[PDB]
Short mmCIF file of C-alpha atoms and ligand atoms in Angstrom, two decimals:
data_model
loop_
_atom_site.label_atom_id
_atom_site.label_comp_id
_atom_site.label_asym_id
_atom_site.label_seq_id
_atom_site.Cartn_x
_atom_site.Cartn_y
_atom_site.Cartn_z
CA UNK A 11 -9.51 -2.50 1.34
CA UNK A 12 -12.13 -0.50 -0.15
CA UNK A 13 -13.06 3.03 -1.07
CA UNK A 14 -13.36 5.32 1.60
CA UNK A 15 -12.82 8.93 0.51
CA UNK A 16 -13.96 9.55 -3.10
CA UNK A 17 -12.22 12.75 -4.18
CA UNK A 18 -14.78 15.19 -7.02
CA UNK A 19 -12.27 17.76 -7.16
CA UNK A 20 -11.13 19.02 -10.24
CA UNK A 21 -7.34 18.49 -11.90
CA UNK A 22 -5.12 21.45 -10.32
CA UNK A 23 -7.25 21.94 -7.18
CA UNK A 24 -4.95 20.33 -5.29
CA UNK A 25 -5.57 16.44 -5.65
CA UNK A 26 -1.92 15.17 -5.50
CA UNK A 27 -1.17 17.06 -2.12
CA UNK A 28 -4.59 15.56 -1.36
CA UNK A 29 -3.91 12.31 -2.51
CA UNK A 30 -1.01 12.34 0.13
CA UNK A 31 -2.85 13.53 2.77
CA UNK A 32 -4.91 10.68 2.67
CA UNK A 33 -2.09 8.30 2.28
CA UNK A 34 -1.00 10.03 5.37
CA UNK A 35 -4.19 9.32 7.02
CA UNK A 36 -5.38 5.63 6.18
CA UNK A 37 -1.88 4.28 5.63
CA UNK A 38 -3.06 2.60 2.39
CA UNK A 39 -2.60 3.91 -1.21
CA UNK A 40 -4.63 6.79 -2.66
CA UNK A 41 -5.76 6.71 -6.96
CA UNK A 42 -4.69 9.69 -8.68
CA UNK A 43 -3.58 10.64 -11.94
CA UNK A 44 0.32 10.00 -11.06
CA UNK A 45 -0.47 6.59 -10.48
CA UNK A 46 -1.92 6.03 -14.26
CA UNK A 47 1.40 8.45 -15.25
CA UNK A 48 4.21 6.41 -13.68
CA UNK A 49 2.94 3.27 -12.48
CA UNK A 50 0.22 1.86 -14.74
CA UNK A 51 -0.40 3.15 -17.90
CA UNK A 52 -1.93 0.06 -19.23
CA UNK A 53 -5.33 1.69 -16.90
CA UNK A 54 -5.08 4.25 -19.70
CA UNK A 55 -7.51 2.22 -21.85
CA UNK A 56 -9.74 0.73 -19.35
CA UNK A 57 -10.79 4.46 -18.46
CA UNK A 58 -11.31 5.09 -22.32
CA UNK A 59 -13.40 2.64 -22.52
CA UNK A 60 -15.46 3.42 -18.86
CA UNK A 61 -15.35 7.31 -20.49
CA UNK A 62 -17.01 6.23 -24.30
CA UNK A 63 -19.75 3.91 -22.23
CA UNK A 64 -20.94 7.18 -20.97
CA UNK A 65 -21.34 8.59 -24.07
CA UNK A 66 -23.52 5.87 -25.63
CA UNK A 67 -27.42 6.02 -25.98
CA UNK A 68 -28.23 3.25 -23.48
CA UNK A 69 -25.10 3.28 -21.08
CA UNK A 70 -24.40 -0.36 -19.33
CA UNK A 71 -23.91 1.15 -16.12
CA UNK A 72 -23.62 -2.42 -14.24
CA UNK A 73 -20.42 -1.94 -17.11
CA UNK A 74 -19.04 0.80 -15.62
CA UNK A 75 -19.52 -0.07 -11.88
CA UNK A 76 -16.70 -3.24 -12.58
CA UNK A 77 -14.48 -1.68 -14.36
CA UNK A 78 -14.66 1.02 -11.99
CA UNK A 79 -14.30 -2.04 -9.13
CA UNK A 80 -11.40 -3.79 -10.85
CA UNK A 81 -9.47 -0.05 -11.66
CA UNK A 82 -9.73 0.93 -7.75
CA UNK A 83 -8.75 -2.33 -6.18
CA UNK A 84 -6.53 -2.30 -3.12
CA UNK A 85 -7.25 1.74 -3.00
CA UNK A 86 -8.57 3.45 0.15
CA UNK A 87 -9.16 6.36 -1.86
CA UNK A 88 -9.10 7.86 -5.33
CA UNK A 89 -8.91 12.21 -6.39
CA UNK A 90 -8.11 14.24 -10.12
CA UNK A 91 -9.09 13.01 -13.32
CA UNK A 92 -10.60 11.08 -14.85
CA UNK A 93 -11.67 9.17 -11.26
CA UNK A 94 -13.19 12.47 -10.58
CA UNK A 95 -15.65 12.84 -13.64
CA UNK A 96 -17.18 9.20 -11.88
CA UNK A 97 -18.36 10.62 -8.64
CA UNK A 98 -21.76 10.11 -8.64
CA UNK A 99 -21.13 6.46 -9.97
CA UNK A 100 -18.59 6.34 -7.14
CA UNK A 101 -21.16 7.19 -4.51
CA UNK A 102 -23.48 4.36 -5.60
CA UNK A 103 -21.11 1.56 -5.65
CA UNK A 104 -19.66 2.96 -2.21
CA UNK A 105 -22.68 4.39 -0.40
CA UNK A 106 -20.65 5.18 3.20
CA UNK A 107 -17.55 6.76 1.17
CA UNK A 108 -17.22 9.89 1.87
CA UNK A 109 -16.91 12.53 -0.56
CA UNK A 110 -14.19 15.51 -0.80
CA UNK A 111 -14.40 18.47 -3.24
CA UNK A 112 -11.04 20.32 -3.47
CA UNK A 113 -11.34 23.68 -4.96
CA UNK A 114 -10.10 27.28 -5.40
CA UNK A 115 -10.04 30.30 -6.90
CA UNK A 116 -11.68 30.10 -10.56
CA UNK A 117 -8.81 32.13 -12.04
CA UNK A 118 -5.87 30.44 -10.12
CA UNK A 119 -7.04 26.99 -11.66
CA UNK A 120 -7.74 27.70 -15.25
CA UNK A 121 -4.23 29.23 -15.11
CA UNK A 122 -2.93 26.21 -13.86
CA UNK A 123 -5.20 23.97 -15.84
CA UNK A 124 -3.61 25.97 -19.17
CA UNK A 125 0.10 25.70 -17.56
CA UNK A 126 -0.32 21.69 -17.34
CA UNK A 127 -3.23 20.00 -18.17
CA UNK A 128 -4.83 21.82 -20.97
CA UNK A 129 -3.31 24.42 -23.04
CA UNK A 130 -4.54 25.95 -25.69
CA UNK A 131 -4.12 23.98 -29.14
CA UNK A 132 -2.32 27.16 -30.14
CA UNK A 133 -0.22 27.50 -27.76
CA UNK A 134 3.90 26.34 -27.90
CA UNK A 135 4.22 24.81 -24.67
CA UNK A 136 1.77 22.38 -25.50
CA UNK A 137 4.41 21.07 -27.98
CA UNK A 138 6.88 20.96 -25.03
CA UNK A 139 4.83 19.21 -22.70
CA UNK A 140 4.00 16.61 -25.52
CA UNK A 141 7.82 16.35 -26.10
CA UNK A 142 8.79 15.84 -21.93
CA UNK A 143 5.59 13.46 -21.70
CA UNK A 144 7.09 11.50 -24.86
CA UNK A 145 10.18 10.23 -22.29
CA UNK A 146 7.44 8.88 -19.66
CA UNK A 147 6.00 7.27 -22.87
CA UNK A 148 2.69 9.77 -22.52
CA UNK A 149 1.34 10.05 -25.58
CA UNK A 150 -1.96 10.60 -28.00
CA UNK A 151 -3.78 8.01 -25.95
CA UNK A 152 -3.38 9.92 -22.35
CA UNK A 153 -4.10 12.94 -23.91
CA UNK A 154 -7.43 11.87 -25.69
CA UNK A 155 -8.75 10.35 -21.65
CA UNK A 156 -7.60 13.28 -20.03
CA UNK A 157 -9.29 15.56 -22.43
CA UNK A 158 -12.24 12.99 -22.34
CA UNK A 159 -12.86 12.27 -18.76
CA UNK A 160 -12.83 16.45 -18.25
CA UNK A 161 -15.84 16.76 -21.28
CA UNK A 162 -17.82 14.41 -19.57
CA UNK A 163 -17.30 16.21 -16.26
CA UNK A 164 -18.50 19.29 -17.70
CA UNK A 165 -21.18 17.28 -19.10
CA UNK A 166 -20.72 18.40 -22.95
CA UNK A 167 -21.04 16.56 -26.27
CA UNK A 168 -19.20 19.72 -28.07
CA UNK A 169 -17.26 22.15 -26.47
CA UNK A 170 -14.42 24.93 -27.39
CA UNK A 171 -11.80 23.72 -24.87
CA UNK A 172 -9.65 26.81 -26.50
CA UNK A 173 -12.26 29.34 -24.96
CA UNK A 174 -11.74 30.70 -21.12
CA UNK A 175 -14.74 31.98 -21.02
CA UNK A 176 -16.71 28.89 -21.26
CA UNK A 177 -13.90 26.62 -19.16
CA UNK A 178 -13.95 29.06 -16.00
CA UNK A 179 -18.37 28.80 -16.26
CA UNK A 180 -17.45 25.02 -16.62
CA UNK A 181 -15.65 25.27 -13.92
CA UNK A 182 -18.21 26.92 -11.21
CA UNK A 183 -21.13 25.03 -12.54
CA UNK A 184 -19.25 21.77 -11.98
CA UNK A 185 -18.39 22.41 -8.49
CA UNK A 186 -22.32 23.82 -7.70
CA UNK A 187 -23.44 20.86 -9.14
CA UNK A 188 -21.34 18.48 -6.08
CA UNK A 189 -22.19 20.75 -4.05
CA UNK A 190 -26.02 19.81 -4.90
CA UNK A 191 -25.80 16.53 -5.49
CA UNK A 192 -23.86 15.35 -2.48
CA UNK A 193 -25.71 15.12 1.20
CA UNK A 194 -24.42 17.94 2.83
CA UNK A 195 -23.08 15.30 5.65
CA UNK A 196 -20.95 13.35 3.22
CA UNK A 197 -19.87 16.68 2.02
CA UNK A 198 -15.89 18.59 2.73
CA UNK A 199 -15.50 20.92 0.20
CA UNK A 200 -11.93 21.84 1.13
CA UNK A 201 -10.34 25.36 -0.02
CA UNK A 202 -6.55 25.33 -1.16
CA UNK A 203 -4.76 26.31 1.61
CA UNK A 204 -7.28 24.69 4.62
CA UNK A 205 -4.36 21.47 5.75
CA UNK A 206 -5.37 19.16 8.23
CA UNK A 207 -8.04 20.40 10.89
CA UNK A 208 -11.31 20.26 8.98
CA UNK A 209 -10.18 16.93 6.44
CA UNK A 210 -9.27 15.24 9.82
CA UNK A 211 -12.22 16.30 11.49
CA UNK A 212 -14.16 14.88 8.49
CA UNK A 213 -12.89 11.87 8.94
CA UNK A 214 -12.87 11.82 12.52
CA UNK A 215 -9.08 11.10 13.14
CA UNK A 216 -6.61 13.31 14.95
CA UNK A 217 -4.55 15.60 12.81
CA UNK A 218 -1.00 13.52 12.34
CA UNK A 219 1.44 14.67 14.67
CA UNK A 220 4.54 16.10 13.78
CA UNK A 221 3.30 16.00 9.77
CA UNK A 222 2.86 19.01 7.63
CA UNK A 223 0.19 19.36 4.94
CA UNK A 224 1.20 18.15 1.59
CA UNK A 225 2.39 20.95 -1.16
CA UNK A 226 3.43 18.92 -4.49
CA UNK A 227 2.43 19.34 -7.70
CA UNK A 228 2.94 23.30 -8.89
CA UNK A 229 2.78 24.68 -12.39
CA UNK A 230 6.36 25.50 -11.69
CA UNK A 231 7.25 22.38 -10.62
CA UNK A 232 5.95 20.68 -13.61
CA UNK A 233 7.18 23.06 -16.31
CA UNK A 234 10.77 22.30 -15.01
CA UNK A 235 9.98 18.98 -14.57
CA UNK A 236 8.70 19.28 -18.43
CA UNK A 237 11.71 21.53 -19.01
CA UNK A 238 13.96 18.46 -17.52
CA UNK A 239 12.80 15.62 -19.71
CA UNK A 240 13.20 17.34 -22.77
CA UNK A 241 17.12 18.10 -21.71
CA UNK A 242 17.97 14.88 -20.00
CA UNK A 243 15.58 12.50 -21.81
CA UNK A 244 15.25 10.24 -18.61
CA UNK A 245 13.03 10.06 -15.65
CA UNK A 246 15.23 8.41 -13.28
CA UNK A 247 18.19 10.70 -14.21
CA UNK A 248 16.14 13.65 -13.22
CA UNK A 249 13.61 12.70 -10.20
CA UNK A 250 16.13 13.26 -7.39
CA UNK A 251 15.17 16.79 -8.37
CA UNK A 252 11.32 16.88 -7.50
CA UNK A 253 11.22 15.29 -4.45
CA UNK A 254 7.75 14.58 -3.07
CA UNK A 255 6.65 14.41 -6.55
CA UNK A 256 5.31 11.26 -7.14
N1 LIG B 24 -1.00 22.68 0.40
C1 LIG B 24 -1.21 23.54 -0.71
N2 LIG B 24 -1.42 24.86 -0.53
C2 LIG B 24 -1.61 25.66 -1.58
N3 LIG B 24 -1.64 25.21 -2.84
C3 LIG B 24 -1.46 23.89 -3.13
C4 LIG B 24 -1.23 23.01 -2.05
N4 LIG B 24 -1.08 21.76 -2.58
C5 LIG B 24 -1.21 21.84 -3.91
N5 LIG B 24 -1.42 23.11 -4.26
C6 LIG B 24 -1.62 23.58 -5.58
O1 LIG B 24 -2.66 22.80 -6.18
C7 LIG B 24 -2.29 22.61 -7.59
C8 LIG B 24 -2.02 21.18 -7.92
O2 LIG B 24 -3.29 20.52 -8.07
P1 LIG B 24 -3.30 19.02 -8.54
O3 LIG B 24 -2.43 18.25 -7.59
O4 LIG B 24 -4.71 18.48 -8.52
O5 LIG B 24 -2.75 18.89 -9.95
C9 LIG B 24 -1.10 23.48 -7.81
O6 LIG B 24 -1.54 24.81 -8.13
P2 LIG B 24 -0.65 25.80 -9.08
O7 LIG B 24 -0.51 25.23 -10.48
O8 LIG B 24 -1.32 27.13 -9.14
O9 LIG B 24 0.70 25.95 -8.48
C10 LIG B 24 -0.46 23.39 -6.50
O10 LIG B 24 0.47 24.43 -6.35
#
């Protein structure tokens, strides 16, 4: 198995439900954030050190391609951070994958971006996601990749990531830039909200019968999911409440 769909969408533009879709589609797992979160932490690292390479004067990109190779093994597909920031590297190593851009509305996604992702560094709820994440055993080290992989996204050495303003431009001149980059026939930029018909059309399979259109992952889901691991302090004690989740 090899990559087939390489996902350049941004976190909170709908990369878990697409991440299932896909699942849905190939029968064979999808990369994604989640996977890092609850199944393999120990990748945590090997994108730090993929994410730093980048930032060096002479980049060993022959460095980057393996670990790339070795993180994405057995996946038909990958989508969200930080396998996002890598899609042009992604293209190379897999010239017939096909590329997907999820997106939305600019001020829908920093909203949710600031609900789950990336608060402010003033804000209070960024202590309580800290303090749920501390029970999956998130800590410092996911937060420093996350933050990382989305800087080198955006392309910048120093940036305010407490500043709307320059996230939201961020935001549009990241998705322009796929947009530019990618041939426009290796190209589905798909809207929240689209399901099936074009991504199955994309891919040239018929939409799957009987199936709806994967909707997981909502701020509100994941401030009470936040909200539950601080009260119950266990995952497995809790995750018959967020069904789908995962
Ligand atoms: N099928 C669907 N239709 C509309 N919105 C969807 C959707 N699937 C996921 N989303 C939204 O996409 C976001 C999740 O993105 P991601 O999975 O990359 O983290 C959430 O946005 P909100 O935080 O505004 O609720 C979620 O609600």
């Amino acid at each position: 198995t090899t990559i087939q769909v390489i996902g350049a969408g941004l976190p909170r533009t709908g990369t878990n439900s697409m991440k299932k879709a896909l699942e849905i589609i190939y029968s064979k797992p999808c990369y994604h954030m989640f996977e890092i979160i609850f199944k393999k932490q120990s990748d945590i690292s090997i994108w730090q050190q993929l994410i730093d390479e980048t930032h060096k004067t002479t980049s060993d990109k022959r460095k980057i391609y393996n670990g790339l190779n070795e993180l994405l093994n057995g996946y038909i597909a990958t989508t969200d951070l930080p396998s996002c920031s890598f899609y042009k590297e992604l293209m190379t190593m897999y010239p017939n994958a096909k590329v997907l851009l999820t997106i939305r509305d600019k001020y829908d996604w920093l909203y949710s971006l600031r609900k789950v992702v990336l608060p402010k560094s003033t804000d209070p709820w960024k202590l309580k996601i800290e303090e749920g994440d501390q029970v999956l055993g998130i800590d410092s080290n996911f937060y420093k990749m996350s933050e990382d992989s989305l800087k080198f996204a955006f392309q910048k050495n120093h940036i305010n990531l407490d500043d709307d303003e320059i996230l939201l431009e961020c935001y549009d001149e990241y998705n322009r830039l796929v947009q530019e980059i990618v041939p426009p026939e290796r190209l589905l930029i798909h809207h929240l909200g689209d399901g099936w018909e074009s991504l199955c059309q994309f891919l040239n399979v018929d939409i799957p019968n009987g199936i709806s259109y994967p909707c997981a992952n909502s701020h509100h889901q994941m401030t009470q999911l936040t909200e539950q691991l601080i009260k119950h302090k266990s995952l497995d004690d809790i995750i018959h409440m967020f069904p789908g989740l995962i």
